[PDB]
Design a protein around this motif. Structure first.
Motif, PDB file in Angstrom:
ATOM      1  N   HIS B  35      -3.535  -4.114  -5.176  1.00  5.17           N
ATOM      2  CA  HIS B  35      -2.753  -5.152  -4.531  1.00  5.17           C
ATOM      3  C   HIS B  35      -3.089  -5.077  -3.042  1.00  5.17           C
ATOM      4  O   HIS B  35      -3.523  -4.031  -2.561  1.00  5.17           O
ATOM      5  CB  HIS B  35      -1.262  -4.882  -4.711  1.00  5.17           C
ATOM      6  N   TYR B  37      -1.487  -6.242   0.892  1.00  5.62           N
ATOM      7  CA  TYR B  37      -0.410  -6.913   1.577  1.00  5.62           C
ATOM      8  C   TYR B  37      -0.691  -7.041   3.063  1.00  5.62           C
ATOM      9  O   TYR B  37      -1.487  -6.282   3.633  1.00  5.62           O
ATOM     10  CB  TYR B  37       0.939  -6.242   1.295  1.00  5.62           C
ATOM     11  N   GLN B  39       0.952  -7.448   6.954  1.00  5.82           N
ATOM     12  CA  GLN B  39       2.091  -7.094   7.769  1.00  5.82           C
ATOM     13  C   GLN B  39       1.848  -7.520   9.208  1.00  5.82           C
ATOM     14  O   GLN B  39       1.053  -6.906   9.910  1.00  5.82           O
ATOM     15  CB  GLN B  39       2.320  -5.587   7.691  1.00  5.82           C
ATOM     16  N   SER B  43       6.734  -7.106  11.881  1.00  7.40           N
ATOM     17  CA  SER B  43       7.222  -7.813  10.702  1.00  7.40           C
ATOM     18  C   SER B  43       7.158  -6.981   9.425  1.00  7.40           C
ATOM     19  O   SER B  43       6.562  -5.908   9.398  1.00  7.40           O
ATOM     20  CB  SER B  43       6.429  -9.108  10.526  1.00  7.40           C
ATOM     21  N   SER B  44       7.786  -7.489   8.366  1.00 12.80           N
ATOM     22  CA  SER B  44       7.807  -6.794   7.082  1.00 12.80           C
ATOM     23  C   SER B  44       6.616  -7.241   6.244  1.00 12.80           C
ATOM     24  O   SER B  44       6.172  -8.390   6.332  1.00 12.80           O
ATOM     25  CB  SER B  44       9.103  -7.090   6.325  1.00 12.80           C
ATOM     26  N   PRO B  45       6.114  -6.350   5.383  1.00 12.32           N
ATOM     27  CA  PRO B  45       4.966  -6.640   4.526  1.00 12.32           C
ATOM     28  C   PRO B  45       5.203  -7.765   3.528  1.00 12.32           C
ATOM     29  O   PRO B  45       6.326  -8.000   3.087  1.00 12.32           O
ATOM     30  CB  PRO B  45       4.738  -5.305   3.820  1.00 12.32           C
ATOM     31  N   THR B  47       2.887  -9.674   0.138  1.00  8.73           N
ATOM     32  CA  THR B  47       1.696  -9.578  -0.686  1.00  8.73           C
ATOM     33  C   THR B  47       0.776 -10.786  -0.485  1.00  8.73           C
ATOM     34  O   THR B  47       1.257 -11.909  -0.445  1.00  8.73           O
ATOM     35  CB  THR B  47       2.075  -9.554  -2.187  1.00  8.73           C
ATOM     36  N   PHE B  50      -2.327 -10.031  -5.607  1.00 11.12           N
ATOM     37  CA  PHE B  50      -1.658  -9.269  -6.643  1.00 11.12           C
ATOM     38  C   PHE B  50      -2.624  -9.056  -7.809  1.00 11.12           C
ATOM     39  O   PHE B  50      -3.411  -9.949  -8.144  1.00 11.12           O
ATOM     40  CB  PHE B  50      -0.429 -10.058  -7.112  1.00 11.12           C
ATOM     41  N   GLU B  51      -2.585  -7.871  -8.397  1.00 10.65           N
ATOM     42  CA  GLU B  51      -3.403  -7.551  -9.558  1.00 10.65           C
ATOM     43  C   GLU B  51      -4.875  -7.884  -9.409  1.00 10.65           C
ATOM     44  O   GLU B  51      -5.424  -8.716 -10.139  1.00 10.65           O
ATOM     45  CB  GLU B  51      -2.815  -8.256 -10.790  1.00 10.65           C
ATOM     46  N   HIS B  54      -5.344 -12.003  -7.851  1.00 10.09           N
ATOM     47  CA  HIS B  54      -4.412 -13.115  -7.989  1.00 10.09           C
ATOM     48  C   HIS B  54      -3.773 -13.405  -6.653  1.00 10.09           C
ATOM     49  O   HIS B  54      -3.392 -12.502  -5.924  1.00 10.09           O
ATOM     50  CB  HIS B  54      -3.328 -12.803  -9.024  1.00 10.09           C
ATOM     51  N   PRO B  56      -0.647 -14.918  -4.891  1.00  8.71           N
ATOM     52  CA  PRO B  56       0.710 -15.414  -5.124  1.00  8.71           C
ATOM     53  C   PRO B  56       0.918 -16.785  -4.492  1.00  8.71           C
ATOM     54  O   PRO B  56       0.334 -17.100  -3.444  1.00  8.71           O
ATOM     55  CB  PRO B  56       1.585 -14.320  -4.500  1.00  8.71           C
ATOM     56  N   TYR B  90      -3.156  -3.775   4.158  1.00  7.85           N
ATOM     57  CA  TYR B  90      -3.214  -2.543   3.371  1.00  7.85           C
ATOM     58  C   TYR B  90      -3.515  -2.798   1.900  1.00  7.85           C
ATOM     59  O   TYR B  90      -2.919  -3.690   1.298  1.00  7.85           O
ATOM     60  CB  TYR B  90      -1.877  -1.789   3.417  1.00  7.85           C
ATOM     61  N   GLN B  92      -3.490  -1.329  -2.022  1.00  7.37           N
ATOM     62  CA  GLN B  92      -2.637  -0.391  -2.745  1.00  7.37           C
ATOM     63  C   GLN B  92      -3.181  -0.265  -4.150  1.00  7.37           C
ATOM     64  O   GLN B  92      -3.645  -1.242  -4.722  1.00  7.37           O
ATOM     65  CB  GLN B  92      -1.215  -0.930  -2.890  1.00  7.37           C
ATOM     66  N   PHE B 101      -1.733   4.125  -0.998  1.00  3.40           N
ATOM     67  CA  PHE B 101      -2.025   3.067  -0.038  1.00  3.40           C
ATOM     68  C   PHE B 101      -3.285   3.369   0.761  1.00  3.40           C
ATOM     69  O   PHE B 101      -3.614   4.535   1.016  1.00  3.40           O
ATOM     70  CB  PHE B 101      -0.893   2.890   0.989  1.00  3.40           C
ATOM     71  N   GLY B 102      -3.972   2.310   1.172  1.00  6.16           N
ATOM     72  CA  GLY B 102      -5.146   2.473   2.009  1.00  6.16           C
ATOM     73  C   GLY B 102      -4.606   2.741   3.406  1.00  6.16           C
ATOM     74  O   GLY B 102      -3.416   2.541   3.666  1.00  6.16           O
TER      75      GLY B 102
END
Lengths: 111, 111
Positions: B35, B37, B39, B43-45, B47, B50-51, B54, B56, B90, B92, B101-102
């Motif tokens: 995955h 994400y 940031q 701020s907050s992370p 995504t 995904f997978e 994908h 989102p 990052y 994951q 995590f990277g």
């Protein structure tokens, strides 16, 4: 989709205990799992809690997680606070085809 | 037990394409989802992938994820950078009992 709300910050003295909440906008927090990771300032994340309440290889007994169905909020608890615990903590949650993060809480250790 | 390595930072002009790599030390990078994400500065992370690959809903198609079996790595590519894309990224991935995590990649947009 859904949102996870956490307090902007928490603080406590060394040796003390803190509890960080992670609320869910809609849906039962139990529906899907909740992870927790620690990110020290200017650094890369590391999981501290998984499967809503499990502790990965290496993470101390000091960390633990739970889930309150009545309040619809998961929570990370850190007991026996150490200076190294100062960091930002984020709760993670999954949704079909998507990973959602909490706003994050900054923990300040007062010692 | 493994590590995910990403470049420390990247700085490019808007309109250009960037490839943030995420190489896994040991273990097959395919046996688990990767995955990615984003940031923002303060701020907050969130995504962006995904997978493995994908995207989102809501995330612009200029963002794409890929997995290269032969190099045992994964990549986040951003085509046609926009200033809004300036952030820390990052990757994951997972293992039996833990999330890895990277190190993170600081991408600066020169526009």
């Amino acid at each position: 989709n859904f949102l996870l709300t956490q307090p902007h910050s928490v603080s406590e003295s060394p040796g003390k205990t803190v509890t960080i909440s992670c609320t869910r906008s809609s849906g039962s927090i139990a529906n899907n799992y909740v992870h927790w990771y620690q990110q020290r300032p200017g650094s890369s994340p590391t999981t501290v809690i998984f499967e809503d309440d499990h502790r990965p290889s290496g993470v101390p007994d000091r960390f633990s997680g739970s889930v309150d169905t009545s309040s619809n909020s998961a929570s990370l608890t850190i007991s026996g606070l150490k200076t190294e615990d100062e960091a930002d903590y984020y709760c993670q949650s999954y949704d079909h085809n998507n990973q959602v993060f909490g706003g994050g809480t900054k923990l300040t250790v007062l010692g």
